[PDB]
Symmetry: D2
Subunit: 251 residues, 4 copies
């Protein structure tokens, strides 16, 4: 009930769905949280639904916006003190095969899913290192960082990139004794607001040829592995992939 005592976390894309569940459990475990999203209506409502401004605040930011990343860390420091924990969770999908992906679609997806995670990881190392915070960078990296989907070409590229870039950062932080860990989390199919707006999506995802458990997960499934990775319980885990997917990748 205080597994994140003293932690100060930034969670990108934290105003709905998976990111909001992470933020909710982080606050319940004692962390101070800054959540981001592009829309202030959603974000301010989300923060107030979780706790007081002494526990959680919202910062408007598109994770592809490099300059905004500096302002986000500045604001979080001023509200809560030194940032210890970063969850790079914001991401988008293009439902196109590699063959049918336009270059504009390619660049837009990579700006959020890859450039954004790079900007956050790079800045996080610079701001977290050598502060004795037990710092942890958690990069959201999908079953699509492991297995292809014929209709998710650019998404697959971005998730494979985050999977292995995170190992580079993990190693550099470990070898330099920075007291920063970097790991990736790989959700299978999760019942999100988006999933609920796509007719038939959940049923298709629950077929046993896709998810062997025969149903999809919920946002708290991803929140709990993120609590583990943000806490000092996982102080020896770095450079590794944590898969929570109902068996999807085991077959």
């Amino acid at each position: 009930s205080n597994r994140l005592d003293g932690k100060v976390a930034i969670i990108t894309g934290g105003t709905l769905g998976i990111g909001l569940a992470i933020a909710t459990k982080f606050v319940e475990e004692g962390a101070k949280v800054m959540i981001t999203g592009r829309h202030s209506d959603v974000g301010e409502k989300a923060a107030k639904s979780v706790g007081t401004p002494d526990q959680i605040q919202f910062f408007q930011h598109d994770s592809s916006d490099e300059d905004g990343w500096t302002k986000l860390f500045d604001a979080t420091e001023k509200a809560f003190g030194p940032v210890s924990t970063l969850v790079n969770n914001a991401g988008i999908a293009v439902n196109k095969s590699v063959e049918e992906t336009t270059t504009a679609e390619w660049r837009k997806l990579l700006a959020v899913n890859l450039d954004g995670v790079f900007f956050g990881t790079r800045l996080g190392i610079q701001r977290m290192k050598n502060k004795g915070l037990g710092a942890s960078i958690i990069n959201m990296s999908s079953i699509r960082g492991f297995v292809g989907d014929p209709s998710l070409g650019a998404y697959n590229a971005s998730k494979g990139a985050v999977r292995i870039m995170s190992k580079s950062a993990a190693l550099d932080c470990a070898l330099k004794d920075y007291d920063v860990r970097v790991n990736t989390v790989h959700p299978g199919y999760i019942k999100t607001p988006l999933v609920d707006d796509l007719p038939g999506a959940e049923e298709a995802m629950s077929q046993r040829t896709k998810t062997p458990m025969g149903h999809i997960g919920e946002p708290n499934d991803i929140a709990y592995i993120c609590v583990y990775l943000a806490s000092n319980e996982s102080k020896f885990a770095t450079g590794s992939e944590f898969v929570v997917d109902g068996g999807y990748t085991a077959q």
Copy 2:
């Protein structure tokens, strides 16, 4: 502080080192625990050091002993009620290359590390399935289930076997709606009693070409990932590998 409320766990090789830390944290999170080991002096002392017989007991058992597995589950049921959780942690190593492994060494190691995990996993599914327990089988499966060591030939064989056999069991339990999950845990180098009896072992393991963090882990590092996997927090995780290795396999 009650993340394992109501759980009933068997932990093989639970009387020292990693297994004892798992048992200790399991009891602290509300589980009832039966620990095993071959030696009753060690085992009875270990159980009493953790809690009362209402919380934790010892059962003398070599995990290669197929008939003893039945007696172990029987005893645990009689002490604590239906078993929900099994940690197959007992294991041995032969420090021989494949080239230099005698067949007697091969069969002895496989009897503990592979037959034993098979016996426990098979029996666990039979006894746990369809009871609404949120059941979880946690198979200890090493960095040596991922990367070879020239001087651990039979050990590598056994850990690779446990890694993939566990996925078969995970899938069968998921597809049949048994309410049993099966996952593997892959420690890097951990400061155990054995490590402390080998002069120079810890220093060699801490070299950056081996463990990038520059130091080895502690038994509680493995206990905490086991708490996560035994708890209902991980109810969507099955068929997956959880690596806690200080960066060993990331490079």
Copy 3:
């Protein structure tokens, strides 16, 4: 057309199906070959169908028979000179889940698929090392060395074991400059005699949720990757997995 010039190969389970195709292409690329199998009627016919006794011979041997392995290498040396190449291809399956596998089934499958590959790999290193042969041990290791099948529990165990044991042997041979490489080959579904005797098997295997190419492979698909790995073309490849599966593991 002489990619295996001067090589001397043992291929276990070489009298039908995949093993026979490997032997056929090996002979066509200039290797001398000893094929094994349990039945002399099949084996003598198979050898004569491929070439003369100066090119290929049959040796009756169950790969679980440890003492027979010595006799097999002796016979191959006497026929053809020093063995350079070993393909551990003999294997069996039990169509049982982990839950439903009897211990007799478990031990029988491991005797062929795991003990047998260990016996051949161990002996191969001892006999091949330090002879300047460009020696290569090719261990047949399945898509089931990567992904679980709920009805192939013991098979999954054996293939995971061969996958990682082979890396141990690869590393030891490389670090000791033995001039022996060890790699694994991982077929997807292949149209074998066995497949043709199971009604409906090929159609089930060709479903896109199983093999994305929509059809299964043929024995020559596995023969060609084995030629590459046995030849000096692959002199820098060791400790690695070579997957030929129509896309099975990519999704």
Copy 4:
């Protein structure tokens, strides 16, 4: 000696080192080849060193140049007929950690290593599909598509991206019966011109803690696996990773 009979191949970065060896072996196996590079002095010399214009030509092209990709395929078609084979081999490295990578460095590396491979793969599918060519796209994807290097942050990102994007493309081509395969090749350390210009690089790469064989590979090591993947010998291989690394990733 005619394993690529009738094939028409584009090899990016084909004027030196690994790419030139691929082109050389491709021509020796009967393929017609268009090699690319940025510098015409190098490229025209390279082509003429391998064969006549009826066998091999050079096309000046930076693989980050999207519009040039169309012109490259057009020119290759006019010289040799329909393209069957694409090797995306051009790539660059920044020797910076994630922490120390400037955004300009990030974008420059991704433009070549990731955008370029995407442009070539996308165009290759569009131009190769449904032509009965036995088409094959071979994406060069490094040991750094598997394991991190603390000083290769952007490179790791790009190689992880190519690793998994290639599986998406493989699956789409297989499920749509396009007669196009897509696979990745993962060299370890190879003695290239670049390696020879870095004092001490080869010795560092040959340390057993890096390459267990105790020496690095040569360009023909990568050419031979590319011949296999471009030939119809590998007609059942798609969506998979082919590692040729002297044991680097096995430990």
